[model samples]
Target: PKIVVVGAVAGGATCASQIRRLDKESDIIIFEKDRDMSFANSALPYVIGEVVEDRRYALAYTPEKFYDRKQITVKTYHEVIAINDERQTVSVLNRKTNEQFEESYDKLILSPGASANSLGFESDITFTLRNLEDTDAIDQFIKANQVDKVLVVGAGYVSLEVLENLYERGLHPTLIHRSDKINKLMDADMNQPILDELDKREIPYRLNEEINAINGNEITFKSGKVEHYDMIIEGVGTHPNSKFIESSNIKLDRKGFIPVNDKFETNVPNIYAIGDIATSHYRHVDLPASVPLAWGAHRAASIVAEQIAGNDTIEFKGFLGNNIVKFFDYTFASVGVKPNELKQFDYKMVEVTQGAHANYYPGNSPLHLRVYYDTSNRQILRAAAVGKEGADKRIDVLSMAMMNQLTVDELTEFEVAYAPPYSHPKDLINMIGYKAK
Candidate 1:
């Protein structure tokens, strides 16, 4: 069987490589609109900050190197314009040349990902961080243009990454958040420490403010406020890039995300969608959840490859919708479900503020954690952690339990590397299960 994959980055890149492993004889080729085929798109922020000085290190493999390593053909700058499911052929456009061609496929995987939202401002200084080109452009534009004051609009993860990295690049960044607080995923109590960290760093920020227009470098806010910055970066949410699929028989949801089954199969036979372009199979919530993260994309890749190779045992269950982020020195994380979404379940809530390690140990710090659970069934509905240290560790453990369908009682009896430097006898996870009301 021949496989045709679209827009190689996270999902398409991984699927092509995995298909080669599953079936060595199949002709696998990935078509990417961008020049860079397989690269670590998540680590682009670090490259901008020079935290990862080697730009080459961020790339998984060039298209040439990927062919050598995986024996999978990756056609860079080649975009699949449309898929003719009946004829089993796809129309392709060569971005380098003006030539168009057709390719046949027994199985097709769509991973075109999503389009980054824009402010629609006609200023030349406005930029969005989405790919390797954008990352490099932001750094070069700032350095060559003598940009000192940077305005980052939005409070999501990408905006935060840009804010931190731009600050690292010796620029003063002003964060303009449309909402009242950051990270809409976590509760206000959990994000309180993040707000504290921002203040400690002396970074100026505006909340509940919307950008009206950008005339040259001057930004007009909806609240009748005006500010001028040398550079502007917006990290608003994105919509799925499934407009090309409208002509195809393949179905898409109301929100523009393609809905796939547990086997990662679309409504149409032999066609699958994954990564940011598709809705995720959720664990706790029955609603269609679209989580654009590396883990989900990677997991979907293997599942699709295995299924195509006639292996039905390795089916995808769903994602836990967990997320984590570091703000300067402090880190915060959440998993399972959001606190406000607990209305459907008969749940009891638990909150604990305990030392991450032995209290007497040097550099021991508090780990403020919360768990909304159904104690009657030993189930954990939602969990959140925030503090200087050990927050991510607790989140990791909770994510594991949620995935395995483990009970809350098991968390109480959970073992840890008990030491002054590591964790207390009753770790954060242990206390959550024990203290659940």
Candidate 2:
């Protein structure tokens, strides 16, 4: 059997490796457009900030290592241009040589990931950090030019991370967003403390505004305001890179996200789609997120591999959509649903601010925790937290609780570990559960 995988970052690499493990004699090939394969996309921000010592540390595996260890063939700088489902083949382009070829496959997996949404205007001063090449380019530009003041467009996760990294690098970043709030993961009330933190750092931002046009270093805003900056970084969200598959027999959502069934199979048989380009069943609202995460891709790929291997034991159950982020001096995390998403499901939410550890402990910090629950059954709907420490720990516990269908009452009864420097006897998780009850 011949297996072909597209895009070799998180999902494709994992899927290819798993397939190789399942069938040692089968021919497996991974096509990645980027020159670097199996690098950590999440580490790009840290790389830009110099938090990570070397960019090579961000890579999980090199092409040579992949072939030497896994016996999997990885073709870097090879872009799969099209998929012919009827013939079960994909047309590929050798980006380095400007050559095109076709490869036949018995099974195919699409993990093309996503690309940044452009601002319609292109300039040497504007940059987007989505991949290793983007990070290198942005880093090079910052070093090559006089980048003193930066204007960051968009208030999403990537925007916030880039803003913090720039601040750490001694660059003044003024953020402007179309929305009133910065982090969409947290609701208005949950965002207050974060906004306070931002103000405490003396970072400047303009809310309810957007860039109308970019003329060199000068930017005109939708509110008729004009600003000048040395550089601009766009952290706007991403659109799936499914344009190559548009003409294929596979079905794509309205936003170009591939839709797959429980087996991770597309509309066409023996063809699978995973990673950010594919929509997974969101367990919270029982809908699909236009952009899913790398974790979901791993699970989906495992299911696909098992099915292809004829195990038929594992199934793709979907995701809770959990995420974590770090800003200046705070850690923010969320799992399952958000507060605004409860109205459609008629769920109630409760918020609590508790100590991350024993109050008397030396490094105790305030943890802002919020939980959403079904009003009728008190089942955990979602959880969000922000704190200096212990925020991720609690959110993970809550995420697992939600996955297990645990109730608020059951959460209170959970026997969590305790220590003066770690957590109180009545942990914040216990407190939130008690409050919900």
Candidate 3:
């Protein structure tokens, strides 16, 4: 049996390797157009700060070792040009040598991650970091140019990462976004402190600033103001890399992502899709989902791999979409639904926030927690946390609570290991439960 995987990122690489482990005799061929595999593109911003000191370390796997040990063939610098659904064949092109050929496959998996998104700006100085190639360019440019001041044109995770990395490199960057807050995914009330953090850091920022164009070293905004900067890094978001399969009869959302079932199988038989290129229902809303995260890819790949191995014990529960990131002296984390999302779904929600540890604890830091529960059923919908020390762990606990349908009142009764130095008599999570009531 021949299985062809058309990507080397989170989903495709994982499925290929897992399949190889399950069935050694099955011929597995992984095709990646890039020169490297699994570049860990998520670490690109930190690569600028020498946080990732070695370029080779960024690669999750090398072709030689992966192919030799796993008994799977990995063809880097090879692009899958076309797929013949009827014939069960895929046309491949050697990007380095311009050679083309076709290979037949019994099963095919598509996990072509995501493509860098641009907001249609005509500035040569502006660039988006999505892949290892972009990271290399940005890393080299920051070092060679000795950039001191930068302008980040977005307010999402990518932009915040760039902001933090630039600050670490002794460069002060100004952030400009169309929204009023940094993370639009979070509730407005919860996002207030992020604005306070910006003020505390003395980092300049402007809301409702729409970038018009970039002329020379200056950026012109739609409001007719211009600012000069050493460089402009745009970190808007991503669009699925679904153009290659657009001509196929496969079902795709309006945003060009393959719509998949619970098994990660698309409408096409023997053809599965995962990673940023696919869509599922949002866990809480039951509406059309479009989460494009690395974890999403991993979960989807696991589902397909297990189903193929006939280990059908587990179900692919949609993502709660929990995420955490650092910003200077603090960390912010969020999971499941925010208040605004509940309003969008037409469900009334209750939110509660509290400190992380006991106030009497010497090093107790404020744990900014936001909990969301359905007003109709009193079921936990989602939760978010922001703090310097324990935000990530706190958010994880709440995420699990939401997954189990634990309510705010139930959380208060929950008992946990306690030490005065580590936690209060009543943990912050329990305190949040009490506050919610």
Candidate 4:
């Protein structure tokens, strides 16, 4: 059987490699428009700041390693233009030589990934870190240009990382967001400590500011305020890269995200969609959810590979929508539902925020944790954590707790490895549960 996968990022690469391993005789090929496959796009900010100067180290997988070792073929500069479901064929265009070709496949996987949302402007200053090429452009500009100040237009995980790196490099950046908070995925209580940290650093930021447009080096706001900066990085959001399916029979959500079942198969037969472009039901709330994260894509691809290998017993459980990021000295992570998500779903829940480590511990960086749980059942619905050092570690504990549907009482009884140098007797996760109980 011939398996053709489009786009070789996290989702496509994982799916292609897994399928090759499962069926050695099956022909597996991946089409990537970029120069390389499986690049670590998440680490672009560090590359920009010169903290990670080695470009070779930023790649998640080298073409030689994947193609040579796995016996998988990767066609760089090959763009899949259209999908023909009836013929089970795909139309491709070679970007380098302007050549078009057709390839027939028994099964097809659509993991083209998503594109960074644009501000709908043809301006020259806006940039995003979706791929290595974009990062190289930004890195070169940062090195060659004299940038005194920078402007970040979003407050999501990507935006926070970019802002923090710029700040650490002594380039004071001004952050502007349409929302009032940094991470909409995290509760306000969990983010308060982050606000405190930003205040301590004296970073200039504006919340709820609607951007009018970018006029050269300045961005005009709806509030009649204008801020001038040397550069602008927009980490707005992402939309599904489903242009190939525009004229196809595949169904797409109102937001253009394809709807898939637990098996990661689309509405059409012999076709599958995963990664940021697909939507699945939430395990807890049973509501339609889509989180464009690497972990989500990996999980979806793993499930798809299992089904392709004729092993259907392993179920593809839905994601809790977990996320994490590092901001200077602090690390933040969140899982399941946020408070706003709970409110949107109309689920009643009790919540609390507490310090990560014991207040008396010396040299212990405080971890801030917030949990939203069902009031009647006391089951954790969602959680968010933000602080220094142990912030991410504590969130992992809660992530597992939420996965197992552990209640507050069960969480308090949970025993985790601890020491004064690393953690306290009662871990931050346990403390949060004890406080909630």
TM-score of each: 0.96, 0.94, 0.93, 0.92
List the lowest-lDDT window of 10 residues for candidate 1.
Answer: 280-289
lDDT string, candidate 1, 158-199, tens digits: 788888888887889989888786877777767776677679
Q: What residue runs in model 1 are displaced by over 4 Å at the alpha carbon?
A: 284-287
Angstrom error of the Cα, residue 189, model 2: value is 2.0
RMSD of 1: 1.7
Candidate 4: where is the Cα deviation over 4 Å? 61-65, 344-355
Top TM-score model: 1
For each candidate in the order shown, give its overall lDDT on alpha carbons: 0.84, 0.83, 0.78, 0.79
Residues 1-437 of candidate 4 have per-residue lDDT tens digits of 78999989889999888887788888888889788798887777887777887867778777778878898888889999888887888899999999989989988999988888877767677788788888888766766777768888898888888888888777878888887877777765466655666788999888887679778887788778987878788889887888888777889887888999888888889899999888887776666788888888888888888889758787777778888887767777888865556765433433444344555667666556667777767777887777777767777777787778788667778888876566668776666667774
Which rank order by lDDT, best down to worst? 1, 2, 4, 3
Q: After superposition, how far is residue 362 of candidate 2 from its true place, in Å?
A: 2.7
- Residue clash pairs of candidate 4: 356-367
Better of 2 and 3 by TM-score: 2
RMSD of each: 1.7, 1.9, 2.2, 2.4
Worst ten in a row by lDDT for model 3: 345-354
